[PDB]
A and B are shown apart, each in its own frame.
Chain A
Amino acid sequence: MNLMLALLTNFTLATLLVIIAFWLPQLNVYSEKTSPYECGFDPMGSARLPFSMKFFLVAITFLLFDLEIALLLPLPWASQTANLNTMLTMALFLIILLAVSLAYEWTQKGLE
């Protein structure tokens, strides 16, 4: 029944060392200037986070290449099998079905 006590040791040793390093000398008796100087070298920066298109398409493109490796995941379990002409010719399909999705998008990526 240790899996599950194989990690709750590891996280309660993790959260131990945080509060002892951070929070315990955070109650110390120094002067502790609380003035708004804590931000470094970008003093005010009175703006909202602007949209960047070339850093959105990187999120979606990965997600659609991430799905069909989980289809591709039970290939070693698909070895000790019955009829294997089917198993080979279907395994080669998905990879090409992943490969074409490159080549269409490959004619327009952008400065990624």
Chain B
Amino acid sequence: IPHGKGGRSSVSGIVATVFGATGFLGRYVVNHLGRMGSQVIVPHRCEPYDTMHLRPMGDLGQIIFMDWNGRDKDSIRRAVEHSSVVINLVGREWETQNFDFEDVFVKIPQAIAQVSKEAGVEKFIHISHLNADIKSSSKYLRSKAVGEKEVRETFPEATIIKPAEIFGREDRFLNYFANIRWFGGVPLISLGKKTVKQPVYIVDVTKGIINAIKDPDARGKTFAFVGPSRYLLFDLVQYVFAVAHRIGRLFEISPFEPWTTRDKVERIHTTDKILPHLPGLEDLGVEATPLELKAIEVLRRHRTYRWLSSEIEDVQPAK
């Protein structure tokens, strides 16, 4: 039950449990739950120090930390016992040299679709992507579609979310570009055919959740997040170099956290603008943010003062 103003130090009824919550997507969620105030039980894998910038979000006794491996059952059956909602965003990029990567999107969202489901939770939420299609792409992009399909068997009403591609503040998607101060700028693959996707702004995706977390009546009704205005061009890569003007890893360096001479060069250019009958963002209101307002901020190289911004795009066509 709620009480008083929801500024800080209130009760607000909900008791979430947000798995992951260290990466760019999982962290920025917990910031908006350390405002309205709630028992946001965040468990973390193996990181004592790398989670320290998360503590001045929970007021005093709001958040709480636990350690958990993920494959073992009861390590994720001990935190899910006292909860109201539980959302999932676990996962990564490329296959690691210890794990198997196949069932990690199959058994592990099912390992927390175990007695977690039975114990009395509600509003269990998973994530998707706008390009995860069971047609022959990719090793990561499909086998996420296994997680769309093989985990849908349990919890027949979830509101699994299907956000668009994200541009943000500390992300990897747009930041994979303009970090290519290198012996050449090679696009994918010297072509501007299907560029670009829908770069939704990360504040909207973390505002969609917290409007769905007490919506009500949003269970089973999966959602797909609208992007900015409107499609975009290959001019994006030219626009990135327009204004730019050309955790827990190791002690010295981690010798393998690469740029992946594999599927990753084409894990983003397979676009597949999916079904526009999905409800999917504006009805999960209210949020609609462009790119050309929030583009100055995260792009940051050695000029640092002089921008003189005028670069834009028409729509582009098929708008």
A residues with a Cβ closer than 8 A to B are: 24-25, 27-31, 34-36
- Contact residue among A24, A28, A31, A36 (Cβ-Cβ distance under 8 Å from B250): A28
B78 to chain A, nearest CB (A): 30
In the complex, which residue of chain B has the Cβ closest to the Cβ of A33? B170
Q: Determine if A29 and B300 form an interchain contact, defined as CB atoms under 8 angstroms apart.
A: no
CB of B249 within 8 A of CB of A28, answer: yes
Provide a sorted-by-A list of 13 A–B residue pairs whose CB atoms are within 8 angstroms. A24-B252, A25-B252, A25-B253, A27-B253, A28-B249, A28-B252, A29-B247, A29-B250, A29-B253, A29-B254, A31-B170, A34-B300, A36-B304
18 more A-B contacts (CB under 8 A) besides A24-B253, A28-B249, A28-B254?
A24-B252, A25-B252, A27-B253, A28-B250, A28-B252, A28-B253, A29-B247, A29-B249, A29-B250, A29-B253, A29-B257, A30-B247, A30-B249, A31-B170, A31-B247, A34-B300, A35-B300, A36-B304
Chain A residues with Cβ below 8 Å from B247 are 29-31
Note all chain B residues with C-beta closer than 8 A to A25.
Answer: 252-253
B254 closest partner in A (C-beta): A29
Cα–Cα distance between A27 and B249 once the two chains are bound (Å): 12
Complex formed: what's the CA distance from A35 to B304 in Å? Answer: 9
Chain A: minimal CB distance from B24 (Å): 10
A36 to B305 Cα, complex, angstroms = 10
Q: How many B residues are at the interface, by size bracket?
A: 10 to 19
Which residues of the partner chain A approach B170 to less than 8 Å between Cβ atoms?
31
For A38, the closest partner residue in chain B by CB is B304
Give the shortest distance, in Å, between A49 (CB) and chain B (any CB): 17
A48 → B minimal CB distance (Å): 14
8 A Cβ contacts from B225-247 to A: 247
Closest to B300 in A: A34
Residues of the B chain whose Cβ atoms lie less than 8 Å from the Cβ of A28: 249-250, 252-254
**Chain A, residue nearest B24 (CB):** A31
Inter-chain contacts of A27 with B (CB < 8 A): 253
Residues on the B chain within 8 Å of A35, using CB: 300
